[model samples]
Target chain A: EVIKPFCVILPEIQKPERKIQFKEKVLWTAITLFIFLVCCQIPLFGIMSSDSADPFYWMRVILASNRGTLMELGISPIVTSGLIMQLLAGAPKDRALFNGAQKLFGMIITIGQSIVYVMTGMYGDPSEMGAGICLLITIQLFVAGLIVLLLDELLQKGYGLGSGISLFIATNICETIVWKAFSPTTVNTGRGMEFEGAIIALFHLLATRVRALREAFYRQNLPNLMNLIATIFVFAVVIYFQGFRYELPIRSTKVRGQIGIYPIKLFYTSNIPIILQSALVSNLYVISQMLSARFSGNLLVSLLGTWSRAYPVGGLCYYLSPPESFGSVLEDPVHAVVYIVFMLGSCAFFSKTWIEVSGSSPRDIAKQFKDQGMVINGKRETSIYRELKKIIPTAAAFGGLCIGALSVLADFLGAIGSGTGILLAVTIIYQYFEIFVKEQSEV
Target chain B: FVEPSRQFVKDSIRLVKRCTKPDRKEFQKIAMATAIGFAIMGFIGFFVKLIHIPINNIIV
Candidate 1:
């Protein structure tokens, strides 16, 4: 009741119930996705685009952000709030606060980040914008942020089949692929008139300058064959991994003839850890960028982190999210090696950390299984715990490492949305495929 | 009434505990430590190297 979101009025007691019908779920998902697409397209009225090297570019799909638009802030505020909430899920009291205060915390972050974007002159030139324009920019971003929150609520409140944040992300990612495949715009690059559409450009080059542009466009700055291949490759791998799980059989204690298999998936922790890892890394990048923007000359502070010409050039910040390319890795093998380890290792740690709080740990699963049924194998209770303890953590480690490598692959291949986008898109779609089938099967 | 810094105070402590705990066998411990240690040292080295930015010569 206290979290009075402006756009959608859901009185505490009268909020939509969690009993959505099959067809109703599809309708709401379509409606929400449509609105999201429209919002993504609507450019900010009074704002001019300013280039800051697009810090959110790598995770654009996951964030559902579009630069120079109303959706510029994206789901970053939600992710930021989620970061704190996920960290707190270890305790009962804090978990209650998390569910209660999520929206308020979201708004707080939205306003705070809105100020950062505006003040940092990423939205437009600061000197040109008076205090009036500056405040206008902040208010608009906050309003748009609130609107997104309500839409996410609509889907998550049993109006749709899956998390609205995830749906929006998948939508954003799919749109990138579609646009890259066949966009009609033409842009001159590398002393040639190339169709902006990657696929179209490839054909154009083949017919026009067959041997000349083939090698160059193999992995062009924008989407090309390599990126396209990488995108599809990530999709196939994630889909394959989803089915790759260990089905542990169980027998009932209370009911005589009941049987079930608890599926411990290869991706035991799913995409939460990777998403959280990206959020943590990107947030650090934002802070570092902002810091270096304000003070470039201060030697001591710059030594810690600094941005030169709006690019990460010096300090701990530059190497945090190093570009993943063969040339990059080959040129700076040490930097590449370090980046790979940091990304994979952090992901593994966070994956293990997430399950501890997410009720997916061996102890938690053992408790749930014990309440429902007994292991009729006459094994000690610790048997289930022992069987699972090693497996879950190992799955979490490998899953995290896989995603880390996938993102690096996408980055290297010059794929759209980086590998993080493609990985999330595949997992999210795979999740939806299961949900749609489950909900519709009984229909 | 809650104090000003109380939320962060609780948050930081819990986060610290979460980072350090979750028991494992020596094999598991070694695996985790090796991977995590490599990252810590690797990134530290990367960070130290970042102080110097040589001009990127790769073709754009």
Candidate 2:
């Protein structure tokens, strides 16, 4: 009876007769890895190879060190952890760990990372003080992350939209637009000009259409026509910006008072913060290095040193004298701890700062909820605020740690400067494609 | 205002409901037609490219 059953199941399985060749599989695997590495490397090259002062030098140092493998491993864990944490922040409370525990864990990890950075810096070389200082500055970033989480929660709970995510998106757009505007090499000048021209023409055509429509409908109401045209222009701009966030429904709130479950965005932390953090950190390092080299022992130098040491990750500078300068003290054990602290701190600090400035506030959100007449579980406004107060800080701490670690990992992996930016751009582009597909599906 | 436009209001509501319904297949047909129209436009674009015609300028 068992044999009969086995025979029947075997026939049902219908496994393929042919097997893949080891040699062919190996070749394909190699090719895939090569392609992936190249894709990753290309952006790193673009950002690093740019005629930026410190990045150029750092890239050379990294190449000389041959620490690519370690850097790669370091970067992966941090980024993966960050992505997971951000996703978790958006997840329902039942699924996620206690917010306080998550925040505490994040803080511990951040502090631990700082310690590791300090150790590495101290043992590596005298010139490695920069790494230590970097860590010190990173510590402050944790505060920033907390701030961001708080703000994001405020935005979501208080305001209608996810402010943290929106800020991140806006920041990325602003940075890309600004950078492309400045760097001729980064800008596809001809294509950009054409695109700009098209936009202008589109505007003109839209104006013409409005004029024609106005004349047909309201020939006598000139004031009304003008008002309508203004309204149309405003509406168009709003639509353009509003299309950034794509919400995905998760579960239906079958109850009359409640709505369906929805995922905020596929790409939670729009690449803006990543890009900004990288840019700011790299620039800081370069600046610190330059200042250190110029006036190493002077009072100004001491002050700069203290400041740089306090926040080494973002404090970099270029100098003609020393081949490598700034954060040299990071090569020391004490200095390395300082650097790690700086790095984590910076991440936390920036996260919070960004949230506050980017429309994540109680007042803003309350107004939105009031307008919509939407209450969670029919809770009063004050209770909702109380809930938010708890949620925001927890989210911020978690986000801050993830972001901080990722930033450091990126840097360690020789993905400094615009590598993070490119990664962000690619993610954004992919998200846009996904959104387009979804829209098509809906249609 | 309510009593005078009953017929118009009824007609408008009917039109809206017809347009908004997911199962109405007419909207799907319109969408499909629009897609096909875009594809044909793309094919024309290739021809325009071949001829070195500045279609962008014309569209603008």
Candidate 3:
């Protein structure tokens, strides 16, 4: 038997960093260019008309009508609650019970939500929620919800990718990109000139650097500089035009070393909770409107007024609506202030609720740390856990509030309707490009 | 048959317990691999987008 020397260690496999292979590079370039041109022509060909309202417009209209309230309050809440409940099924204790409950609850919520949404659309307003039109709309909404749910489940179980959240974020990002690309804006618009120019310059610089690097290391396999420049320019332009973020400080009594000390990102939770909450509010408003239209001074209408304000045009009271008047409820000074306060409260409530359901608590983290034999500040394990429990909630609350506000702002700016769609398109295309390049590299 | 089934169940339990043991090197390898994978993916995405050919005049 031969014995190998102890010092004879194998070399680690180095990651490949080839500039580009000629065959694949040319092919990819052609494909990318084709896509870029197609995207440009889509607007010109009237495949996507600039004057056209977003698909979300119909959803909004349906949601704004008398049936809108039933859908929002009855349907949306049930669905959202189902989603939350299903997620919570995987919690440590009573796993079987939770799982069983998830299926039962999920079915109940799905059926209930769908029925309410459809019923409201059917009987609501003739102008906004006409029977023929609403029936089609209801079917579409149901299909969309089903598709989203199915896709989410597939992504979770089939692909073994990160949580459905990442997919949701990716979709939103693409939607934003596509919308912006098609949105009509003057060439000399403030953002158009400065941001676009900056992107072009950056792309040119990157292309130059890539060329020089290719020449120095891999002379034979250099990519077309023009293609590289164009792709980078597109990416940079899209990102530059994306929405901005606002940061907020978090206050917590408990501190768990360095990680706990950092300020939380306000929009960490995104606009999901607000969207859910808004859907609920809108549904209630719709029901109230229908009742009021049928029977003036009805008890149900009065009760609904106590819960939510209604508007004449939109006919629904979102989170920003005031107590009495529906139309200018959000615009009213008192309502606005109250809305902001409620936003903060909702943020806190959702953050806590999310942490509990997701098991993102500091206690969970500390336990994980302990299992890994990692000590924090030389403190006892229990102490670290205690500290984390106190701090995590504060961070979650702050993040949730920021996300809520941003989402509301996006809605106000009409960005959520079209911008989100464009963003999702951009992100998906970007992801596809990435996958193709990776596949090329492997080959 | 019953006795064999009981033995098989016990053996599977033992195998599962053994596989679940934490190994530091394995964890490190996984973490490193993930980071490298992400970085490579990002770079490749950038390259593909840069050199993409316009097949049909759709401006990406």
DockQ of each: 0.02, 0.02, 0.02
Q: In model 2, which regions exceed 4 Å deviation? A: A1-258, A262-276, A286-297, A302-331, A378-382, A413-443, B1-60
| RMSD for each of the candidates | 12.7, 28.9, 19.8
Instruction: Output the number of the TM-score-best candidate.
Output: 1
- Give the per-residue lDDT digits (tens) of candidate 3, residues A223-247: 2223234333433333332212222
The DockQ value obtained for model 1 is 0.02
The top-ranked prediction according to lDDT is 1
lDDT of 1 at A117: 75
lDDT leaderboard ranking: 1, 3, 2
Residues A318-381, candidate 1: write the lDDT tens digits: 6776664677678787777777778877877888788886788878877777887666255556
- How displaced is residue B20 in candidate 1, in Å? 32
What value does DockQ give for candidate 2?
Answer: 0.02
List residue ranges in candidate 1 displaced over 4 A: A1-18, A48-62, A81-101, A125-128, A207-209, A212-219, A298-300, A306-314, A374-382, A440-443, B1-60
Model 3, position A167: C-alpha lDDT score: 34
Estimate the TM-score for candidate 2: 0.33
**In order, what lDDT does every prediction score?**
0.65, 0.36, 0.39
Sort candidate 2 into its docking category: incorrect
What are the runs in model 3 whose C-alpha is more than 4 Å off? A1-150, A158-177, A180-276, A286-296, A303-319, A322-331, A377-382, A405-443, B1-60
Worst lDDT run of 10 residues, candidate 3 chain A, spans A40-49
As a whole number from 0 to 100, the lDDT of residue A280 in candidate 1 is 73
